[PDB]
């Protein structure tokens with residue numbers, strides 16, 4: 751089982767930065783939609799759904815730093831979850847050698863930030879833990895953490 755970010759090199763476990771461009775200017779009540787399907791893809795290293803990989807996102811996945819006061823929802827594989835995750839998500843099966851974009855979007859609504867900076871350029875905005883286990887033997891379980899990082903400042907000048 752392997753993943754990559756923005757078509758980069760293979761990732762088999764561990765923590766990886768994922769850089770995203772965000773709507774730079776927003777108003778009170780407006781959300782930010784972070785489509786991570788456009789950035790992270792994973793595949794099965796045998797193909798043919800031999801030793802299918804089973805992946806889900808993990809309880810405890812959360813906003814980072816100042817964003818923990820913000821409201822969040824996480825879309826994963828046809829289901830919406832409150833964010834931060836207080837449970838694990840449903841399981842996605844991965845068996846093809848051709849990468850599958852992760853069916854993952856983060857919806858963010860800033861709270862208590864009106865009149866200033868909402869998100870800083872270069873700041874980790876969320877840490878999303880992903881769990882993999884396959885089918886044969888031990889399943890060789892692996893942990894991934896996706897550190898979502900904003901490429902740019904976001905401001906909410908009004909309110």
Ligand SMILES: CC(=O)N[C@H]1[C@H](Oc2cccc(C(F)(F)F)c2-c2cccc(NS(C)(=O)=O)c2)O[C@H](CO)[C@H](O)[C@@H]1O
Pocket residue numbers: 751752753760761762763793794795796800801802803884885889890
């Ligand atoms: C031991 C193991 O992980 N077996 C898993 C096995 O892993 C591999 C199978 C064939 C080739 C390789 C490779 F190393 F040549 F790539 C692997 C491998 C092995 C460690 C890591 C990774 N990911 S990477 C290259 O570090 O980014 C891939 O894939 C299964 C289906 O996805 C199952 O997922 C199997 O569990």
